[PDB]
Structures are given as structure tokens and as C-alpha cells.
Design a protein around this ligand. Structure first.
Ligand SMILES: *[C@@H]1O[C@H](CO)[C@@H](O[C@@H]2O[C@H](CO)[C@@H](O[C@@H]3O[C@H](CO[C@H]4O[C@H](CO)[C@@H](O)[C@H](O)[C@@H]4O)[C@@H](O)[C@H](O[C@H]4O[C@H](CO)[C@@H](O)[C@H](O)[C@@H]4O)[C@@H]3O)[C@H](O)[C@H]2NC(C)=O)[C@H](O)[C@H]1NC(C)=O
Ligand SMILES: *[C@@H]1O[C@H](CO)[C@@H](O[C@@H]2O[C@H](CO)[C@@H](O[C@@H]3O[C@H](CO[C@H]4O[C@H](CO)[C@@H](O)[C@H](O)[C@@H]4O)[C@@H](O)[C@H](O[C@H]4O[C@H](CO)[C@@H](O)[C@H](O)[C@@H]4O)[C@@H]3O)[C@H](O)[C@H]2NC(C)=O)[C@H](O)[C@H]1NC(C)=O
Lengths: 333, 119, 30
């Protein structure tokens, strides 16, 4: 039990005469606050609010020469309740609408005073970081989202952020299986943004999310396309007696309206047509013009006619195919 | 929506950046209770599929009646697909329920175009 | 030695300060 008393006296010695107000090496070179992240999971991507909920094992290791011990050849890992008694980087996430550290069972948090002095401080954080969504190519979009770590009150003179490990500082991203997204790539940047007061440190973790078209091609595009095909069926019916053709044509726009109404619930209200509303409206225009084609041919016949029928029949599939080709080419790239 | 078949405990070591930890995982063997979804979705959509056959049994030229039946079926099928979408998350998987409703969808479409070619 | 001066200044700042009263109460607007 001698080691128990030794650890007790050493911890008491360390925490005695410790000023939380003073950063490590105050009045000296900047303290190199290395960082390390391990994304546990990306819970969801809220495009309506333009933000994503991310849960990560945020960690930040720095050196504090005061918290230096040599007698015990081991790495103490004190209770998480001691963090309030030690200096900590005043880190904040610039784009952070809402976040909290998990509390069950005890406050999820770590301290580990290594023998040299390196303090491995880590928290289990859930963040609803903000991410400006340019949903103009949606659903064929490549939304880019970032987390912006930055010190609040300290300038680059006093503090300095770096990824301990050039790229290994971020881990667990590959195993993440987003529901509607695929994390094509992630990059880590270490800038020094210059503000009015001075140059502040900055680390910008970035994820280049790619929308999973496999889900939405059947969820949204497939019904609309299928209904468009049904519109083509109208032309086959007849011209001598087309009272059925009018009914078949006019039902399709109602189907379109129902599909659109259900779709609008999930989407935001960005004014640009996006890749989705443009296609839905174009299909709406095509079916509407099919109804107008029926109107014109019916008026002319009751007012040569066979040629009008057949020319319309050939014209509609080819021009719709051109529309589909143009749209896919424009938005796929 | 599920039944607790049984529990199964485990204990292993997990390696992480901070160090080595022991993880106690309790596996709860949950078995799906399909009755609710069967009566909610499968039974009515299957009845829609049968309704498609009703249009087939309709005979004679009878263009207005055939068109009315065929086009009217797709509306209820679409509404059922929309309702099934509620419980479905945004997971990018080819869900069996989605496969089922899509099969019904293309079946009704095939029936309508079958009448189109017959006319 | 720089820290000693800094920490002594921080110690002496709050001495005699009563946060219940705004600066210059009864003398001028804050
Ligand atoms: C308490 O705290 C100490 C101090 O932080 C930590 O001790 C670490 O223990 C790990 C053991 O896994 C060491 O990892 C290995 O260290 C070797 C030597 O590192 C020294 O030299 C390198 C040279 O570049 C310096 O960068 C480093 O700072 C050290 O000065 C490395 O050579 C090893 O390299 C490879 O090892 C295997 C080989 O297969 C690979 O799997 C590894 O991934 C790696 O590529 C390896 O890195 C670590 O160095 C120790 N830290 C230090 C500072 O020495 C522990 O946290 C703990 N130690 C206790 C309780 O004893
Ligand atoms: C998701 O969206 C974010 C938007 O924030 C993208 O983040 C940008 O990524 C790019 C590329 O990684 C970053 O560009 C970087 O700029 C650094 C700063 O450049 C200055 O460097 C010195 C000061 O250190 C100046 O003197 C100099 O004049 C430059 O002005 C560079 O250092 C970076 O590395 C290399 O950049 C170029 C070559 O690309 C060359 O200067 C050098 O070879 C240099 O080594 C890098 O270029 C940018 O800063 C990030 N932030 C932005 C744009 O706001 C993400 O990239 C995106 N997601 C993906 C997956 O890309």
C-alpha cells in the first residue's frame, strides 16, 4: 500500500499552489496544445436547419511543466472531477449551435497526468455544429461541412493548436455509416486567422459529405418519372372518342401534386429550384402540355387530324427524352 | 414492434487512441413482431394489387371504365407508399418494404400499359 | 518572477470591490 500513499502525496503536491488563472509557461513561448479527435458517429444531417449532429471523443493534449512528477513510473488517471482544478484551453467551436458533454453515469471526461508533464484531457462531446448548405444541386449535391475549433481569449502568442500526428489525429471516420450520406473525404487544416485584436489559432476539421443518390433515386425521382411515363400512355388511346384520354391525363397532375406535397415536408425553402424542384416542375410542365396537346387536337378535329395525332405521339417521347438527358447531364456534373 | 428473445453478455478488450479498455456489451436478442406492419401495410397494398386484377377481369372495349379503374388504382398505391415512408429512416438501403411497394407499383403500371397496348 | 507580479495584481483587484453596486453609484451614470 506504499504506492497508494505515494500517489496521494504526489497528487496533493501537484494540486497545491496551482493557479488555474495562469496558462502553462505564462510569460513565455506559446503552449503547444496538441489536439486529437475520434468521431464516434454522425447522428444526423439536418439540412432544414443546415447543421449536423456529431458525437466525438474530443481530446486535447498539452504540456504543463508544473504538473510534473518523477517518483512513480506510471501515468496517473485522476477522476474527472479534478479537471475544474486544472488549467484548460478555452477551446470553443466557432460553428456550434448546440452541444453538451454526456453526463451518464458520471460526467464523461478524462484526465491523465503523464510523468513528463503532458496532460491528456479529453471529453465525450455531442455537437450540433452549423454547416452552410448550398442545396441548389440537391439531391445531387456534395455538401461540404466543417468543424471550426478555435481558442476564444488566447492569441497565437500564448496558445497554439496542432494535430498531434499529421493525419492520425482524426480517427474512426471510415467506420461511420451515415444513413443518407457517404463521407467521401475528410481533411484537417491548421490556420492562423488574423482578427482585429490579433492572430488567433484555428483548426478546421472538414467532411466532404456526398449525398447517397441510391436512396433518393427511388424515394423521389422514381415515382415522378414513372408518372411521366404514364402521361405518354394517353397519346395511344384514340382521337375519335377520347373522353377517357382527358380523364387519364388530368389524373396525372393530381398524382404529381400529391407527390410534391409529401416531398415538400422534408425539404427547406431555398428559392433556387434545386435539382429536385426543377425536375418535378419540368415533369409537371410536360404532363400539363400533354393535356394541352389533347385540348388542341380535340378542338381542331371537332372544329389532317390523324397526322396531328401521330406527330404529337412521336414528338412527346423524344422531347421528353431530350429534357431528361439535359437535366441529368447538367446536374450529374 | 419486437420481442425479447433473450439476452447475451460479452466482455472483450478494445484498443483506442487513449489506451486499452475493457468493454462490457449486453446483447438483447430482439425479434421482429411483423403482425402490426402486415395488417397496416402488406394487407391493404396486396388488396391494391388484387384491385389491379379486377381491372383485368373487366372486359369489352369499354374504354372509359378501363381507364378510370387503371388510373384510379395508382393514386391509392402512391398514398400507401407515402405512408410506409414515415417509419423508414433515411438509411441508404434497399428496404424490403420499399421493394414490396415498388413491386406493387410496377405491377399496376404494367397492368395499365397492358390495357394501353390491348386498346 | 513575471507571474508573481501578475498573480499579485489579480489578487489585489477584487480587494474592497462590492459587485452589488454599479461603478460610481450616486456620483455619475455608468
Ligand atoms: C505513459 O506515458 C508514456 C509517455 O507519454 C507513454 O509511453 C509510450 O509508450 C508507447 C508504447 O506503445 C510508445 O510507443 C512506441 O514508442 C517508441 C519509442 O518512442 C520514442 O521515440 C520516438 C521516435 O520517433 C519518439 O517520437 C517518441 O516520442 C519517443 O521518444 C516508438 O519507436 C514506437 O514506434 C512504433 O512502434 C510500433 C512498432 O510496431 C508501432 O506499432 C507504433 O505504432 C509505432 O509506429 C512506438 O511509438 C511511446 O513512444 C511512449 N511514449 C513516449 C513519449 O516515449 C505511455 O502513454 C505510458 N507509458 C508507460 C505507462 O510506460
Ligand atoms: C470543405 O470546405 C473547406 C472550406 O473551409 C475546405 O477547406 C479548405 O481546404 C483547402 C485545401 O486543403 C485549404 O487551402 C489550404 O491553404 C493553406 C494556407 O495557404 C496559405 O499558406 C501560407 C500561410 O501558411 C501563405 O503564405 C500562402 O500564401 C497561402 O495563402 C495552405 O497552406 C494549404 O496547403 C497548401 O496550399 C497550396 C496548395 O494547395 C500551397 O500554398 C501550398 O502547397 C500549401 O502547402 C491549403 O492549400 C483552405 O485553407 C481550406 N479552408 C477554406 C477554403 O476556407 C475543404 O478542403 C473542403 N473539403 C475538402 C475535402 O476539400
Amino acid at each position: 500500500p506504499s504506492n497508494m500513499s505515494l500517489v496521494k502525496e504526489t497528487v496533493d503536491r501537484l494540486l497545491k499552489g496551482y493557479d488555474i488563472r495562469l496558462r502553462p509557461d505564462f510569460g513565455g513561448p506559446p503552449v503547444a496544445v496538441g489536439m486529437n479527435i475520434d468521431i464516434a458517429s454522425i447522428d444526423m444531417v439536418s439540412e432544414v436547419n443546415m447543421d449536423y449532429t456529431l458525437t466525438m471523443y474530443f481530446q486535447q493534449a498539452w504540456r504543463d511543466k508544473r504538473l510534473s512528477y518523477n517518483v512513480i513510473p506510471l501515468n496517473l488517471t485522476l477522476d474527472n472531477r479534478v479537471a475544474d482544478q486544472l488549467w484548460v484551453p478555452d477551446t470553443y467551436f466557432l460553428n456550434d449551435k448546440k452541444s453538451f458533454v454526456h453526463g451518464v453515469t458520471v460526467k464523461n471526461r478524462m484526465i491523465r497526468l503523464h510523468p513528463d508533464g503532458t496532460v491528456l484531457y479529453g471529453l465525450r462531446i455531442t455537437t450540433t455544429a452549423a454547416c452552410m448548405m448550398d442545396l441548389r444541386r440537391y439531391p445531387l449535391d456534395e455538401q461540404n461541412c466543417t468543424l471550426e475549433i478555435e481558442s476564444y481569449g488566447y492569441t497565437t502568442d500564448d496558445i497554439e493548436f496542432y494535430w498531434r500526428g499529421d493525419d492520425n489525429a482524426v480517427t474512426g471516420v471510415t467506420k461511420i455509416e451515415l444513413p443518407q450520406f457517404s463521407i467521401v473525404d475528410y481533411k484537417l487544416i491548421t490556420k492562423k486567422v488574423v482578427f482585429s485584436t490579433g492572430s488567433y489559432p484555428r483548426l478546421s476539421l472538414s467532411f466532404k459529405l456526398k449525398r447517397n443518390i441510391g436512396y433518393f433515386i427511388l424515394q423521389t425521382y422514381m415515382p415522378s418519372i414513372l408518372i411521366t411515363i404514364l402521361s405518354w400512355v394517353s397519346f395511344w388511346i384514340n382521337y375519335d372518342a377520347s373522353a377517357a384520354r382527358v380523364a387519364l391525363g388530368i389524373t396525372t397532375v393530381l398524382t404529381m401534386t400529391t407527390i410534391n406535397t409529401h416531398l415538400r415536408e422534408t425539404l427547406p425553402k431555398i428559392p433556387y429550384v434545386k435539382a429536385i424542384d426543377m425536375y418535378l416542375m419540368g415533369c409537371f410542365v410536360f404532363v400539363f402540355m400533354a393535356l394541352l396537346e389533347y385540348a388542341l387536337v380535340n378542338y381542331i378535329f371537332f372544329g389532317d387530324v390523324n397526322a396531328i395525332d401521330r406527330w404529337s405521339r412521336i414528338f412527346f417521347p423524344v422531347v421528353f427524352s431530350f429534357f431528361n438527358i439535359v437535366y441529368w447531364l447538367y446536374y450529374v456534373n | 414492434q419486437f420481442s425479447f428473445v433473450g439476452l447475451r453478455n460479452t466482455t472483450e478488450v478494445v484498443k483506442t487512441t487513449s489506451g486499452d479498455y475493457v468493454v462490457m456489451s449486453v446483447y438483447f436478442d430482439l425479434s421482429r413482431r411483423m403482425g402490426y406492419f402486415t395488417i397496416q401495410t402488406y394487407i391493404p397494398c396486396t388488396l391494391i394489387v388484387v384491385l389491379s386484377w379486377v381491372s383485368f377481369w373487366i372486359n369489352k372495349d369499354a374504354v372509359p371504365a378501363r381507364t378510370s379503374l387503371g388510373i384510379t388504382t395508382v393514386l391509392t398505391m402512391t398514398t400507401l407508399s407515402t405512408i410506409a415512408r414515415k417509419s423508414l429512416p433515411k438509411v441508404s438501403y434497399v428496404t424490403a418494404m420499399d421493394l414490396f411497394v415498388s413491386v406493387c407499383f410496377i405491377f399496376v403500371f404494367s397492368a395499365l400499359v397492358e390495357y394501353g397496348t390491348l386498346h | 518572477d513575471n507571474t508573481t507580479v501578475f498573480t499579485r495584481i489579480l489578487d489585489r483587484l477584487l480587494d474592497g470591490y462590492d459587485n452589488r453596486l454599479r461603478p460610481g453609484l450616486g456620483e455619475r451614470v455608468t
